[PDB]
Amino acid sequence: SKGEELFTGVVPILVELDGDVNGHKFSVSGEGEGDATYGKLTLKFICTTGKLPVPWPTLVTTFVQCFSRYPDHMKRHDFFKSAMPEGYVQERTISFKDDGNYKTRAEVKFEGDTLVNRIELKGIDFKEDGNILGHKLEYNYNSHNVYITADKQKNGIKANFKIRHNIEDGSVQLADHYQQNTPIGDGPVLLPDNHYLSTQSALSKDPNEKRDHMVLLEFVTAAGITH
């Protein structure tokens, strides 16, 4: 794709989110960089409204799959880069098992040479002292597979997957994800064969940062196709 060429080096990233979860209104700003050659993401997020009213891990998937490493032999399946620079809309429903749900709508596109992810998040149906609003989730993150399929009538893709959030009692909080992506621009985009993205993420804290924040290091590789 022409789009793919925009990602052969290190690209700066900005993330901006506004959220409302059970009437708790908040905003997050993130900065960092992506190196799709290595499937690599490094960012730091800050809650600019004070304390984040949900656990940081619950927002990781919402906070740029154009930075996934597509093996050369899978180039023709990379929708995400193909939509650039004009970008794509990304919508999800995230269903926290036996708790509430997030619905997210984001636009991912270049502003100059910077890759931007602007998100609106709405959460409803949460239990006041469930694992989310009760802040019972561990500050860590598991490794997943994101299953992608073409969505031809939308000129885009769908994804489904199961995120597992460890609970502080040793249990697990499932977050079912359903995702739809639609290109914004008029250039050709790639409609992929079925495949998946293999993810891993590490969460940390900046020892000098007293605002509520998250440091994220993530690696993602496309897989599931042999030739």
Short mmCIF file of C-alpha atoms in Angstrom, two decimals:
data_model
loop_
_atom_site.label_atom_id
_atom_site.label_comp_id
_atom_site.label_asym_id
_atom_site.label_seq_id
_atom_site.Cartn_x
_atom_site.Cartn_y
_atom_site.Cartn_z
CA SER A 1 0.00 0.00 0.00
CA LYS A 2 1.17 3.63 -0.31
CA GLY A 3 0.15 4.00 3.35
CA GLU A 4 2.58 1.29 4.45
CA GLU A 5 5.48 3.52 3.47
CA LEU A 6 4.50 6.03 6.18
CA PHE A 7 5.43 3.45 8.81
CA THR A 8 8.96 2.34 7.84
CA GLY A 9 10.51 4.50 10.56
CA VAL A 10 9.66 5.73 14.07
CA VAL A 11 6.41 7.76 14.08
CA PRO A 12 5.30 10.04 16.93
CA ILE A 13 1.89 9.26 18.41
CA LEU A 14 -0.71 11.34 20.24
CA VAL A 15 -3.78 9.88 22.01
CA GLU A 16 -6.66 12.03 23.30
CA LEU A 17 -9.67 10.48 25.05
CA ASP A 18 -12.80 11.95 26.63
CA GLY A 19 -14.84 9.55 28.70
CA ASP A 20 -18.04 9.30 30.71
CA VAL A 21 -18.44 6.07 32.74
CA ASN A 22 -21.61 6.00 34.88
CA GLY A 23 -21.52 9.84 34.91
CA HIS A 24 -17.84 10.02 35.89
CA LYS A 25 -16.38 12.43 33.31
CA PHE A 26 -12.66 12.28 32.57
CA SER A 27 -9.99 12.95 29.96
CA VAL A 28 -6.66 11.34 29.10
CA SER A 29 -3.76 12.59 27.00
CA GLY A 30 -1.02 10.29 25.76
CA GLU A 31 2.26 10.74 23.94
CA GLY A 32 4.89 8.38 22.55
CA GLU A 33 6.03 6.67 19.40
CA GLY A 34 5.53 3.62 17.25
CA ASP A 35 7.99 1.52 15.23
CA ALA A 36 5.85 -0.84 13.09
CA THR A 37 9.04 -2.50 11.73
CA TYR A 38 9.24 -4.14 15.19
CA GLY A 39 5.53 -4.08 16.04
CA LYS A 40 6.48 -1.69 18.83
CA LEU A 41 4.58 0.93 20.85
CA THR A 42 5.87 3.08 23.70
CA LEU A 43 3.50 5.65 25.29
CA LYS A 44 2.78 7.52 28.48
CA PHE A 45 -0.82 8.50 29.36
CA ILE A 46 -1.91 11.13 31.89
CA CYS A 47 -5.39 11.63 33.34
CA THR A 48 -5.78 15.40 32.97
CA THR A 49 -8.98 15.63 35.05
CA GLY A 50 -7.54 14.21 38.28
CA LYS A 51 -7.94 10.60 39.33
CA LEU A 52 -8.94 8.19 36.60
CA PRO A 53 -12.37 6.74 37.65
CA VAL A 54 -11.76 3.33 36.04
CA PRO A 55 -8.67 1.10 36.15
CA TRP A 56 -5.95 2.00 33.63
CA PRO A 57 -5.81 -1.53 32.18
CA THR A 58 -9.42 -1.28 31.06
CA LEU A 59 -8.45 1.52 28.60
CA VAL A 60 -5.40 -0.10 26.95
CA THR A 61 -7.23 -1.53 23.92
CA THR A 62 -8.98 1.82 23.38
CA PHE A 63 -5.72 3.83 23.50
CA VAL A 64 -3.40 2.24 16.81
CA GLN A 65 -3.12 -1.14 15.12
CA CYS A 66 -1.34 0.45 12.15
CA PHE A 67 1.77 -0.08 14.35
CA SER A 68 1.40 -3.87 14.28
CA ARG A 69 4.18 -5.72 12.48
CA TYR A 70 2.76 -7.32 9.35
CA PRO A 71 5.28 -9.85 7.98
CA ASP A 72 6.29 -9.05 4.42
CA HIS A 73 4.32 -12.02 3.10
CA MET A 74 1.18 -10.62 4.82
CA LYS A 75 1.57 -7.01 3.45
CA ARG A 76 -1.61 -7.39 1.37
CA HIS A 77 -3.66 -8.00 4.54
CA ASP A 78 -2.73 -4.76 6.39
CA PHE A 79 -5.93 -2.69 6.34
CA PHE A 80 -4.71 -0.34 9.04
CA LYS A 81 -1.72 1.14 7.21
CA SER A 82 -3.55 1.05 3.86
CA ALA A 83 -6.09 3.63 5.16
CA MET A 84 -3.34 6.16 5.92
CA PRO A 85 -2.82 9.06 5.93
CA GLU A 86 -6.56 9.91 5.81
CA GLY A 87 -7.20 7.30 8.48
CA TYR A 88 -9.99 5.15 9.82
CA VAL A 89 -12.89 5.18 12.23
CA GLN A 90 -12.62 2.51 14.94
CA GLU A 91 -15.74 1.57 16.96
CA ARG A 92 -16.02 -0.96 19.75
CA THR A 93 -18.35 -2.44 22.29
CA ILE A 94 -16.36 -3.76 25.28
CA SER A 95 -18.58 -5.96 27.49
CA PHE A 96 -17.25 -6.54 31.01
CA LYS A 97 -18.74 -9.91 31.97
CA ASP A 98 -21.45 -9.52 34.66
CA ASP A 99 -20.64 -5.67 34.83
CA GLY A 100 -21.02 -2.69 32.50
CA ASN A 101 -19.93 -1.91 28.95
CA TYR A 102 -17.84 0.65 27.10
CA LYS A 103 -18.80 1.93 23.66
CA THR A 104 -15.98 3.70 21.95
CA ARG A 105 -15.71 5.69 18.74
CA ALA A 106 -12.26 6.81 17.61
CA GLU A 107 -10.62 8.34 14.58
CA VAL A 108 -7.00 7.34 13.80
CA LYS A 109 -5.20 9.50 11.20
CA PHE A 110 -2.14 11.61 10.57
CA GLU A 111 -1.93 15.27 11.69
CA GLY A 112 1.21 16.28 9.81
CA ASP A 113 3.75 13.53 10.49
CA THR A 114 2.11 12.54 13.82
CA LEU A 115 -0.27 9.58 14.12
CA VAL A 116 -3.29 10.63 16.23
CA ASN A 117 -5.97 8.57 17.97
CA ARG A 118 -8.96 10.73 19.10
CA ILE A 119 -11.50 8.77 21.19
CA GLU A 120 -14.93 9.29 22.72
CA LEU A 121 -15.78 6.63 25.35
CA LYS A 122 -19.14 6.04 27.02
CA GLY A 123 -19.56 3.48 29.85
CA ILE A 124 -22.91 2.43 31.29
CA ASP A 125 -24.37 -0.41 33.42
CA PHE A 126 -21.30 -0.48 35.83
CA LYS A 127 -21.64 -1.81 39.38
CA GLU A 128 -20.68 0.87 41.87
CA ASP A 129 -18.38 -1.49 43.65
CA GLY A 130 -17.67 -4.03 40.88
CA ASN A 131 -14.20 -4.65 39.60
CA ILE A 132 -14.15 -1.51 37.41
CA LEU A 133 -15.64 1.28 39.54
CA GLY A 134 -14.32 -0.46 42.67
CA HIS A 135 -10.74 -0.48 41.28
CA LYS A 136 -10.20 -4.20 41.91
CA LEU A 137 -8.07 -4.91 38.81
CA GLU A 138 -4.35 -5.59 39.03
CA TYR A 139 -1.98 -3.15 37.29
CA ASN A 140 -0.75 -5.57 34.63
CA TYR A 141 -1.78 -6.92 31.23
CA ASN A 142 -2.10 -10.24 29.46
CA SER A 143 -1.23 -11.37 25.91
CA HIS A 144 -4.11 -11.82 23.45
CA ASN A 145 -5.07 -12.67 19.89
CA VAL A 146 -7.21 -10.14 17.94
CA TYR A 147 -9.20 -11.99 15.22
CA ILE A 148 -9.75 -9.85 12.09
CA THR A 149 -12.13 -10.35 9.20
CA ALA A 150 -13.07 -8.24 6.18
CA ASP A 151 -16.17 -6.09 6.32
CA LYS A 152 -16.63 -5.47 2.62
CA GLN A 153 -19.82 -3.36 2.64
CA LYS A 154 -18.09 -0.90 4.98
CA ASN A 155 -14.87 -1.04 2.88
CA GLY A 156 -13.17 -2.09 6.14
CA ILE A 157 -12.77 -4.75 8.79
CA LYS A 158 -14.22 -6.27 11.95
CA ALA A 159 -12.44 -7.81 14.92
CA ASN A 160 -13.41 -9.88 17.88
CA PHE A 161 -11.44 -10.97 20.88
CA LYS A 162 -11.43 -11.67 24.63
CA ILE A 163 -9.36 -9.51 26.96
CA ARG A 164 -8.61 -10.94 30.39
CA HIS A 165 -8.01 -8.50 33.26
CA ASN A 166 -6.50 -10.05 36.39
CA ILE A 167 -8.47 -9.25 39.56
CA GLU A 168 -6.61 -8.56 42.83
CA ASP A 169 -8.15 -11.69 44.44
CA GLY A 170 -6.51 -13.85 41.78
CA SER A 171 -9.62 -14.18 39.61
CA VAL A 172 -10.16 -12.73 36.11
CA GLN A 173 -12.49 -10.08 34.71
CA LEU A 174 -13.38 -10.89 31.08
CA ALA A 175 -13.84 -7.98 28.67
CA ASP A 176 -15.38 -9.21 25.40
CA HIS A 177 -14.41 -6.95 22.46
CA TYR A 178 -16.29 -6.40 19.21
CA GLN A 179 -14.73 -3.95 16.78
CA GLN A 180 -15.55 -2.29 13.45
CA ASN A 181 -13.15 -0.16 11.36
CA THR A 182 -14.11 2.04 8.38
CA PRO A 183 -11.71 4.09 6.24
CA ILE A 184 -12.12 7.86 6.15
CA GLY A 185 -10.43 8.64 2.83
CA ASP A 186 -10.88 7.79 -0.83
CA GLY A 187 -7.64 5.84 -1.51
CA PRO A 188 -7.82 2.09 -2.02
CA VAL A 189 -7.66 0.08 1.22
CA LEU A 190 -6.82 -3.51 1.72
CA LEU A 191 -9.57 -6.00 2.55
CA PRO A 192 -7.76 -8.81 4.37
CA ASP A 193 -8.06 -12.56 4.55
CA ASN A 194 -8.82 -13.80 8.04
CA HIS A 195 -5.84 -13.45 10.38
CA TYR A 196 -5.02 -12.30 13.88
CA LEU A 197 -2.77 -9.91 15.79
CA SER A 198 -0.68 -11.48 18.57
CA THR A 199 -0.27 -8.92 21.43
CA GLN A 200 1.74 -8.42 24.57
CA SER A 201 1.76 -5.36 26.83
CA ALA A 202 3.71 -4.26 29.90
CA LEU A 203 2.37 -1.54 32.21
CA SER A 204 4.60 0.56 34.46
CA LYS A 205 4.82 3.83 36.37
CA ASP A 206 7.10 6.77 35.93
CA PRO A 207 8.73 7.14 39.40
CA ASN A 208 8.81 10.93 39.14
CA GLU A 209 5.22 11.35 37.93
CA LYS A 210 2.64 12.27 40.57
CA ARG A 211 -0.29 12.70 38.24
CA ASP A 212 -2.44 9.59 37.67
CA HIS A 213 -0.78 7.95 34.66
CA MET A 214 0.21 4.79 32.81
CA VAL A 215 3.42 3.89 30.92
CA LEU A 216 2.82 1.23 28.24
CA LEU A 217 5.29 -0.87 26.20
CA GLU A 218 3.53 -3.13 23.66
CA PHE A 219 4.53 -5.48 20.86
CA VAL A 220 2.10 -6.77 18.24
CA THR A 221 2.69 -9.15 15.31
CA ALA A 222 0.21 -10.21 12.64
CA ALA A 223 -0.05 -13.97 12.18
CA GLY A 224 -2.27 -16.79 11.02
CA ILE A 225 -1.37 -16.73 7.31
CA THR A 226 1.54 -18.78 5.92
CA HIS A 227 2.11 -17.47 2.33
#
